[model samples]
Target: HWGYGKHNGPEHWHKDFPIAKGERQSPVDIDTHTAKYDPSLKPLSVSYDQATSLRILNNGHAFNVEFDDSQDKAVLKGGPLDGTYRLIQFHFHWGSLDGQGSEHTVDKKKYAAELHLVHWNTKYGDFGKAVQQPDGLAVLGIFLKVGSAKPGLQKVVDVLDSIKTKGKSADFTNFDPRGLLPESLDYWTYPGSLTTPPLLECVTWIVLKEPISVSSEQVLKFRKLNFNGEGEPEELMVDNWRPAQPLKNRQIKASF
Candidate 1:
């Protein structure tokens, strides 16, 4: 199976998922110097219902908090998008140790970790069908800085023990994801793909410029989660982020 190890890392993904080398790939470095500041870009419009949160799962790749996207329980509009997008799931990518882990970088600097709130365009009916199209997905990238306490993250951390192994999950409802966002909605956007396979080039990435605070202890807790399922010698789940892809000829738009 694909993994973040020496033998089956990002470099080996393309052997199976060819789109890993496709144009408009994700998690690119945001070179603010070249990023165009578009004044006309509308401010983001987000509405998330806490009750829509379903369950948190340890998918071996990362721990994902699933949302009920059956309806528009939580949705996002405006902000570098044409139609509405429903929240499906939110997950994190972190390093094995401190100082690196984020999928997307800023000014060539990597963060301690990154948070991805995955959403799908409503035009395509559901996430499954939407992901196959070019304008299918929209992901919000929030960089995690190591310092200061983040009260909003305690609930997510509290449930880690229950899902210490791969495939483990637990009830995780009525949790508002909005509390995790930064103060500034100011962001950088571009056309990109899912950082992982099949590396579909259908995402409109809306990356927040400001970062959320996370203490080192809290960050280390994420590393304790196992990548292998029960009975296997638990493989540590860390450094799960994909490396930054080439920018190619895309433009990074700024909503400042």
Candidate 2:
């Protein structure tokens, strides 16, 4: 029951988008307990600009925002993350239940959910061009686990009752998810590729180890999204993650 668009998800994404099959994926299994790491490689800073004017769009695959012409509302500022990368889209990954929310598995333990903040480098004339660069994209992965029910995430989860279909959206206007970030900015980072089509190998991924908590009700609600582009209740998003890709010759950094 992996969550994917009926005809354009995990199975088809790699098929139609040939690049996907060749790119390194996320959500891998790792033994964090026994894992070795160093802080010198961790990012010194990462920045963000509150994207309050962005709206939501259910592209029949995942819920994301189409940002254009209106990003000046906020600015990007991460101590370690420099240059000019602006928020472009945001979305989530969750399990049908609480124990399986995180999209990436560490030593095979999935959390409650995974929220992604997608940004593009301003060096490129536009998002399309940025996608073609080696360092054109940056994605922040926030984990959602079992903890006190968070009201901040409710901003987006509350929309479930209304938009359960693949193409449904909400009054995402003036929404800034930065309010949902974990207090500890410490994170794990790596140079990687997109998990979906147009598998752009230009993404710098930041996966926060400190997960935020949400009500079990919130996760179950995520499963309510339809996998198919049509029909009632539709095919639920049982699985929306990809297997971990090879590390290859890349190095992963951690925030000390």
Candidate 3:
């Protein structure tokens, strides 16, 4: 199985998932120096319903907050993406240390963690069919730095202890993800793929330049999550982020 270890880490992903080395691979070192300003880009927006939140689960890789996406109550629109997209789930990636955790780095500078809000195009009918299309996915990525304890973050953190092991889950409700976003919506946009395995080349990434903050202690709590299910090899889930891939033939645009 694909994981972040010496045996089946990023380096070995190309063997099973050949698209790991594809042209539009994600989690690249976003060199802000090369990010061209795009006046045409609109302010990114999301209308996340607090009640849409369903459950939180440790899917053996990262903890995901699933939403009631059967209906289009939660939608992300207005930037980079041509059409409106429905919010599916939001998840995170991090490292063992506070110094290095974020998936998309700025000028090779890593942050404490990264939050991803995955959305899918509606034209394709459903997420399963949408993912196969070129412009199927549009992910909102927010970097998290070490700072004071975040009030909004605490709500999510309060439940991690209950779902410490892989495959464990619990009911999650009344959560508005916007509370976790940075003040400024300014972001860098690019055509990219999923950072993890299956690594589909269908994501249009909107990575925020300004980052939100979380206490260092909060990041440590995430490290307590196990990478394996009960009765499997015990492993703390950390450094789940894939290393920056090559920018083969793409442009990273900035909406300032």
Candidate 4:
């Protein structure tokens, strides 16, 4: 009952999920010009162990790959963070069409899709506990544009068939999603929240200025997923991405 309509998302979600209407919301339209370059922001540091790559799954709305966060096999630090945040999982938010799938927009421009790498502060312990703290989570956002093919994304797409329906999962190991990252890590950082339900305002969003290229066919493969778990699927798993919310009075810092 939360995500029931398109234009009615925020207003309605604000009703059921009262926390959504708060100041520090997510997926804000990233105004590039307004995002001041901050020399204080450090270059991001990421170390992901391919062996810790556990599996991929379609959980209700989006498809994501989970990792073993019991140890520091995958971790992210720097770029507005003071301590190490262990990577737990990564997911993608997309749309039925090519033009409007991604959550955050650049200068009000929407991308074909968006990728979110969810990480939690080790000091807080695990996702559940970490999610409650303001500095608990760090989600790296990367916009996807349709163009040349991406082998790493293609690998994820190739296995799309196995988990076509909701609540389905498959083994996806020996693969590091960092392969899909753009050439440079130049990004925009800000305080935001998760784009999904609960919409907790606990995420430190690091959106890369550079976008990775994906084939049009690869995006279609993402659309093949079904929102329903059992037989008689009535809906394709599309438009799971929430639209960009207002930026309010938040500051956007850039690492150029």
- Candidate lDDT scores, in order, read 0.92, 0.66, 0.90, 0.87
RMSD of 3: 1.1
lDDT of 1 by residue, 18-44 (tens): 989888998899999999999989999
Model 4, runs deviating above 4 Å:
4-11
Worst 10 residues of 2 by lDDT: 68-77
Q: What TM-score would you give candidate 2 relative to the actual structure?
A: 0.83
Candidate 1 has a TM-score of: 0.98
- In order of appearance, the predictions have TM-scores of 0.98, 0.83, 0.97, 0.95
Question: Which pairs clash in model 3?
Answer: none
**Model 4 agreement with the true structure over 155-176: per-residue lDDT tens digits:** 8999999998878899998877
lDDT of 2 by residue, 113-174 (tens): 78887877777867889788877888888888876778877767776656666677666676
Model 1: per-residue Cα lDDT at residue 241: 88
| Candidate 2, residue 189: how far the Cα is off, in Å | 0.9
Where model 1 places Cα greater than 4 Å from the true spot, the runs are none
- Candidate 3 lDDT at 243 equals 84
Q: How do all the candidates rank in terms of TM-score, highest first?
A: 1, 3, 4, 2
Q: For all candidates, what are the clash counts?
A: 0, 21, 0, 0
RMSD of each: 0.9, 3.3, 1.1, 1.6
- The local lDDT score (0 to 100) that residue 76 gets in candidate 1 is 90
